Design a binder for this molecule. Structure first.
Ligand SMILES: N=C1CCCN1Cc1[nH]c(=O)[nH]c(=O)c1Cl
Ligand SMILES: N=C1CCCN1Cc1[nH]c(=O)[nH]c(=O)c1Cl
Ligand SMILES: N=C1CCCN1Cc1[nH]c(=O)[nH]c(=O)c1Cl
Ligand SMILES: N=C1CCCN1Cc1[nH]c(=O)[nH]c(=O)c1Cl
Ligand SMILES: N=C1CCCN1Cc1[nH]c(=O)[nH]c(=O)c1Cl
Lengths: 347, 348, 348, 347, 347
């Protein structure tokens, strides 16, 4: 007996869809779902998706409320759809995937991931749910996460962090670090050695290494001396140059975090979605320096330092490919006279 | 077991809400309800009401599909709400009443009309439904229809016609003539003697008496001579006067029907609802004669002739009250030198 | 060169998308596309689909404007998608298929039907378009139409009529009768022997055989006597029975057409889409007889007579399967004492 | 001469409806009201209600701008409608009541509360307005507030705080503490002895007693010792247990306030309205501990301590009824071996 | 080849319209523009204007991304339309002007400002763009800004600050101080001597003079003594009186800034647009003092002091006209017994 009113009953009484029996009266208007509480309408859901309001409400109510991979990792691994769950994209306020399997009669393409319509799609499987490892083994295309080993399968250790109800966190009361596995055309695929981004944000930025503490604490000249970074344009690249009309550099989140603590600036997130590299239109409030496309990545500073120090500085211009979050990120490296001028990731 | 998806399943499978178990997939968008059929979306309902789309859909699916009184009758009798049904108002594409009793959880004020919230409201009861005559007997305020006698209650014979799925008709395979009863503050009321409007339409107009046949077939002059109508301004009032820029008269539907057969015109229904008197902005296409507010009533011609021949004609202008469809309709009567100049109903 | 403004320029200047260069100014508001003509806004398209307004506009502009199979045929043959065209579904005012191939960047799953995403889907190919017969020969799943012979493939002769810009017609200046071919999992299929529905409408109903002429012109009794139809309940099944509150029979479009000429009625099309069997909520205006779900099919009368005269009549009720428009339509047959009581299609 | 344009004139020139004469040009679009200022459109009102945009605009413009009872108190006392004013619900951005009396021609069921249509409804009367005490005396059902005594009527002293333009506050320049009176079916009703919630919020939380200062300042072991709370599971109940997957306890707002100062967490207010007990879907950012339905109440800590210490701890499971904000709040008390395990309010 | 899809291509790849060739797939729904990124819809623009969604999107994408005059200055100078650019109004989230010249085929009234349809309109010209000074000279009505002298034209030195992507700032990496020129009916007009407002906001308020530092730092009695302000009701006017039901005074932004640091209050901006004088409905959270129409201006405190000390205090009531932001601001001055009672600007 699945229905709009039963989904709303579950949201009101359980905080999300929990399979309970019951109904509440519902009103739909203004792309919004209301329920009646003691004679007046209370908003339960405002649709920000491109789906019909009542369909989006049901997928949101049926969202996975356990730690799940961040959407950027699923996208980077080519995931098209999830087995018997909904990965909600809190950056977009919308389902991460267009279709479902065994979730919702308006969006399901199948009830089980073994149906043949699913074979060409990369299905996400969650080894914490009974039966899903076996489904991964039978699927032609898929991505599997587990908490532990799967007999005979070679794992890839994922990022330390995961998303729990739209909060990205490294779990202490719950496990957020998974093994990853991937199959293409029926064949298990070796996932590449990879760096991971750290998923921090500008204002709550906390360092995760002694080098990152030093960078936030020392003066730039002091930090550069200790970590032997002369000639790598580290200031320009990480900390930014605000002296000209066009803002120079500023491509690591920790550098924006330091600048923001000192002096606020505006960041227009003009493609608002989860991605390994983010592009912002930045305007510095104190100087008026700005840049329409400022590419930013949150790598652990030690990782970025390892990457840039590995580069040959003998060419004026060069694409540098780095595996990050399982995907190939192209960096542009600009050099002159054997030292770096700039280095930035591309989206 | 109440559910949007179950309402849609009933619409798809039974043509209306029939209390069947089942569900179909539904999308709501654009103030429209869709359902998915073989991979594509099919429209089931477009909301034209001021209620939320899913609520309006459910009240529409739960509409009464038996012959029921036209909305103008229920309005004139002061009905506020219906016992355990929805009277769908097809002139407004909306429920006839704001609230419900035992129909829909978003709009219900009660499950049964015996709840005290219902005592002040004038509840419509339907003697065809078991138990509702007795519910009327116990109610403080109500209107009751029946198909036959009720012990101890004198009936008022209602109109011949009723509304069945939005079609107004005089039933032959089904009964459409009801007895009417009304209670106010626990007291059974004597309903007044009344004329009834005939609820016909311009394009499909059927005469219902020999006088109406003669009016449609004879020339104006011969008709007036036959029924001895000199001095009552029938040429103005019923036939209409298209000779000046302001259209004169034309206040009886049969007169519009006769003109429309001969020469088409535009009628703008600028207050689109069911009422005993209708006002139209009329533009005649042949002549260009027009009138912003042309008040029109569909009386049997014989009834209209009885009314106008039953008036005193000795003052320039006055209000004439006529009980029609159970309500008091004001007409304006204008006379000169002992004869009619014009006579028209007012929408009020 | 793809662009909303370029799509609008083609609509304004060519009547549909024709691949021409140019642009006009466009406004989108109210799920409606406008363009500016001499300082004011003119409506080009009102979106009635569940797709975004600008996407629906483009698919509509890119609709196939040649005669194409009616949507019910394509549905019954299991077509999922069309190769490099849009079949516009004029009954739903929406694309017949959710996705496209080589039409529109928002809806395309592929540029060409040879991409592997297309292999499981049943792709509609059009032999009038160069290369598409060969694309069918190579496709895993498909339906092909042609105007003539294909070397090595046995044809199924399709219906006489097809849809041209939403008008269903039997072409005289253009060919509307196609050969049909179908492949499932790489294997060419033998399509079954089938009847076809005639796709006529109530108001414009044209007889297509002498038997149908006789049915429209003769009285019920003389018709039944002439074609020796006693015992098959044609009076109930085809002519309909309006004598009780529940309307009896009336399951053949020609019978509705004959009634409609004599006396109008209301048909509520409560699942508005193209299908072989249609269900209507019918209310007869003259009698008040009505039925919530009246199943109606437009067969040539001769075909219907062949079907009903080809059944065993010895049990109270059973399901009779009939191949119509390439699909298996279930009918319910009800008999008593060796004669028909009623016979009606089911929408399923 | 009441009209949409006159309501907008009043909003522009007086900040709200003030009965002044005048008109401004208005545009309605996107469920929003605009007025034209020097050639361009300026937003005056965005409709978040289920009423028609122009109707909601007029009720919002006609909102009571004096301190009024919080909506949760009116709801708890059964109020259906207000006499000749609009109580605006700033938690819902909507009128607290569906219908009006003498306010708005689209929503009025009557012009005066003495009309018989009002008799079955509990009408709110404001004794600060001339004539309303007398109307309360003539009404069959109603709730009256006053600043002072009403001859012969037995008062109930209300909460110290009230709402002024959506700000909940204890007045110093204005009076916010009212006497309350209530009638049902023509009969004055004795209002119960009651606790009141304190209406504080998470981030601006300020303590209102020495015990509350101590709780924010001392360590939990120290606080528990001083106030002799051993065996009442006070830590679990008030301060929360974040060590497991499912978040244990945490049912008093002061405990969330303390936790939030230390380490931020997300609170999804999935039924957004004013109520004595609130239910949140909480996710702790530092540990990943979470709970779909966490029931929370803001009682003065001294009040909560009085309540829990009053309980008999000899039964494993027991509903405990406490009058709060004039309504019966059911608490679940769970005990083992003569000490409390948990204690939480229900919504 | 201008089109909706090309505008969206530019927004995605360049951060704004940059004249680049290319297209992305776009969806329009819910008065919102989406583009498809790897199979799912991402929001690019939410229309808050009264224009059609796709038209508003194009004007926003084509917004001037250099420092431009704040909208209040353009409005005060009578500007109706801009030459070959879009001044975006970030206070209204909408174009500052209804029509355009050479920007957008749905809103253009002309392609060049020399067309005769433009003659009756005051056109904004930007002397930093090649050719626009000459266009100003040929225009019948217009306003011109430049960075430097224009031969033979008498300049007016504008405000120090300008708006860069909705951030108001005094430029250090870019120039924000312009010369202003204005023509009416073909004749160059002498712009008046004027004060300028400072365009600061409540929470980030930073002082810009020793007097402003003193006001934030000293006690009111101390500040008043040092700057010899006795008898000018400075406390009432600047700092506010919260002791009564109706909030007295509080008309300078610096006074609200000081009060807000000490104790928060609500400011309802009920006409949300950019203007020299702003009107707020204010409610003090600590006392409950409030005022429906509180007129506020951000003048440098030294400027306000110069203005009030210049006034003759011998009349109970008097309108005082002050040129601010090039416009005539009327102040009401109320005096008794030779000292000020209050002084407030009018909107
Ligand atoms: N600074 C400029 C001006 C245009 C090119 N560019 C470099 C740059 N920087 C980024 O941050 N991201 C890019 O993609 C690119 Cl590309
Ligand atoms: N013809 C005119 C011009 C204005 C008055 N009038 C009569 C009239 N005729 C109607 O039909 N209805 C009215 O209400 C009225 Cl009133
Ligand atoms: N007349 C009635 C009343 C309910 C059953 N029935 C027969 C019928 N007739 C149709 O036309 N179509 C049906 O599906 C069915 Cl079923
Ligand atoms: N902790 C759990 C898991 C399910 C039951 N429960 C207790 C609880 N806690 C609340 O905070 N509120 C409740 O209503 C209830 Cl019930
Ligand atoms: N304090 C009051 C009560 C009504 C008049 N007034 C003064 C005032 N103060 C402002 O701040 N702005 C005004 O426009 C005006 Cl006017």
């Amino acid at each position: 007996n699945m229905s709009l009113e039963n989904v709303a009953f579950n949201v009101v009484n359980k905080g999300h869809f929990d399979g309970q029996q019951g109904e509440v009266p519902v009103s739909i208007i203004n792309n919004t779902v209301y329920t009646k509480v003691d004679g007046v309408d209370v908003e339960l859901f405002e649709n920000k998706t491109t789906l019909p309001v009542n369909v989006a409400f049901e997928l949101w109510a049926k969202r996975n409320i356990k730690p799940v991979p961040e959407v950027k990792i699923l996208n980077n691994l080519g995931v098209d759809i999830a087995a018997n769950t909904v990965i909600w994209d809190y950056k977009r306020d919308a389902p991460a995937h267009i279709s479902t399997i065994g979730v919702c009669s308006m969006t399901d393409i199948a009830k089980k991931p073994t149906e043949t319509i699913c074979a060409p799609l990369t299905v996400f499987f969650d080894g914490r749910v009974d039966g899903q490892v076996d489904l991964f083994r039978n699927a032609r295309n898929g991505v599997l996460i587990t908490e532990g080993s799967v007999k005979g399968l070679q794992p890839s250790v994922g990022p330390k962090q995961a998303s729990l109800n739209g909060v990205t966190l490294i779990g202490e009361a719950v496990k957020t670090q998974f093994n990853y596995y991937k199959k293409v055309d029926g064949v298990v695929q070796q996932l590449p050695e990879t760096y991971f981004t750290q998923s921090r944000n500008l204002q709550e930025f906390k360092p995760r290494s002694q080098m990152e503490i030093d960078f936030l604490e020392l003066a730039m000249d002091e930090f550069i001396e200790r970590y032997k970074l002369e000639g790598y344009a580290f200031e320009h690249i990480v900390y930014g140059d605000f002296s000209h009309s066009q803002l120079g550099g500023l491509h690591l989140l920790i550098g924006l975090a330091k600048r923001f603590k000192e002096s606020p600036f505006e960041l227009e997130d003009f493609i608002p979605m989860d991605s390994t590299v983010k592009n912002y239109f930045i305007t510095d409030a104190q100087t008026g320096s700005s840049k329409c496309v400022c590419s930013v990545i949150d790598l652990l500073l030690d990782d970025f330092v390892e990457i840039i120090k590995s580069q040959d500085l003998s060419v004026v211009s060069k694409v540098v490919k780095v595996t990050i979050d399982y995907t190939e990120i192209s960096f542009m490296l600009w050099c002159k006279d054997g030292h770096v001028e700039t280095f930035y990731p591309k989206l």
